[PDB]
Amino acid sequence: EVIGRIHSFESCGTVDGPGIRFITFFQGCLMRCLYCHNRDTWDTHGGKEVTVKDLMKEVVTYRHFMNASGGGVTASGGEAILQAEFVRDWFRECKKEGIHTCLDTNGFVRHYDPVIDELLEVTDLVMLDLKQMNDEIHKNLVGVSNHRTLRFAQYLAEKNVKVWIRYVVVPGWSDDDDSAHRLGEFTRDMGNVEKIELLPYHELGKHKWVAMGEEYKLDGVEPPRAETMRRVKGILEQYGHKVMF
Numbered sequence: 001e002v003i004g005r006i007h008s009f010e011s012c013g014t015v016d017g018p019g020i021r022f023i024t025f026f027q028g029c030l031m032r033c034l035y036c037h038n039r040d041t042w043d044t045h046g047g048k049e050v051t052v053k054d055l056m057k058e059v060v061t062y063r064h065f066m067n068a069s070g071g072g073v074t075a076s077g078g079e080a081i082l083q084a085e086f087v088r089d090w091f092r093e094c095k096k097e098g099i100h101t102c103l104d105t106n107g108f109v110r111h112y113d114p115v116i117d118e119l120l121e122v123t124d125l126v127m128l129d130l131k132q133m134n135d136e137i138h139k140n141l142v143g144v145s146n147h148r149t150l151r152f153a154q155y156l157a158e159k160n161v162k163v164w165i166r167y168v169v170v171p172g173w174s175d176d177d178d179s180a181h182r183l184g185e186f187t188r189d190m191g192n193v194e195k196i197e198l199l200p201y202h203e204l205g206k207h208k209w210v211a212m213g214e215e216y217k218l219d220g221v222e223p224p225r226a227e228t229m230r231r232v233k234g235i236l237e238q239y240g241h242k243v244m245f
């Protein structure tokens with residue numbers, strides 16, 4: 001059996017529509033986003049060990065709210081795709097129970113082994129984070145190159161995998177016009193992208209950086225204005241996709 005390392009899990013009402021979402025926050029991430037609100041999910045060797053049998057015992061206690069529309073399970077974190085084999089086994093069990101599965105991933109896929117296709121086969125929705133198309137900024141914002149994520153995005157389109165693009169709009173980092181145009185061009189021909197979702201930056205989770213004795217880099221940075229959000233949205237809409245925030 002495959003052993004998963006999780007930070008925590010939680011049941012919570014879906015953003016819209018009835019029913020609940022059972023989210024498992026997997027432990028471990030290899031990106032270093034300055035704005036991470038789950039800083040305590042980076043350590044790959046931390047968290048708690050669980051099995052798929054352990055996880056399904058919590059899932060089934062919410063079964064009557066997960067057949068409801070928008071309900072199901074979501075693998076988040078942290079980066080769930082670092083533990084693709086476990087998430088594949090977990091989703092495989094949810095498909096046996098008629099459960100909708102969602103993968104909340106940064107797309108930092110470094111190796112294309114068969115476990116990736118196997119995971120995607122039992123994944124209904126992929127929420128992919130494109131943090132910055134400008135790789136010069138991306139390195140300063142995330143600590144790594146966006147090449148792996150951009151290649152993974154193209155892989156999802158080739159496989160016609162349902163994808164929601166998530167763009168965290170941070171003032172001074174990803175609120176400029178050029179970066180928005182680059183995002184619109186890159187995702188224009190991806191028919192599998194149902195919509196692009198602009199997430200405004202928030203300072204939630206700053207205490208997690210302080211608990212680990214590390215300075216929060218984005219001190220003083222405020223959430224984007226409603227005008228900036230509308231401006232980026234209007235730019236992205238010029239490339240055909242449904243854009244909402």
Ligand SMILES: C[S@@+](CC[C@H](N)C(=O)[O-])C[C@H]1O[C@@H](n2cnc3c(N)ncnc32)[C@H](O)[C@@H]1O
Binds near residue numbers: 029080199201
């Ligand atoms: C913490 S992540 C886990 C999924 C995966 N690690 C990722 O980042 O794509 C869940 C979502 O919260 C977003 N997020 C993280 N920090 C944020 C912040 N300070 N403000 C707004 N959104 C944030 C992430 O970009 C991602 O869309």
Ligand code: SF4
Binds near residue numbers: 031036037039077106
């Ligand atoms: S990818 Fe997600 S979990 Fe990893 S550092 Fe960035 S915001 Fe945090």
Ligand SMILES: [Cl-]
Binds near residue numbers: 007008025
């Ligand atoms: Cl959390």
Ligand SMILES: [Cl-]
């Ligand atoms: Cl390796």
Ligand SMILES: [Cl-]
Binds near residue numbers: 112151155
């Ligand atoms: Cl590839």
Ligand SMILES: [K+]
Binds near residue numbers: 104105127128129166
């Ligand atoms: K995501």
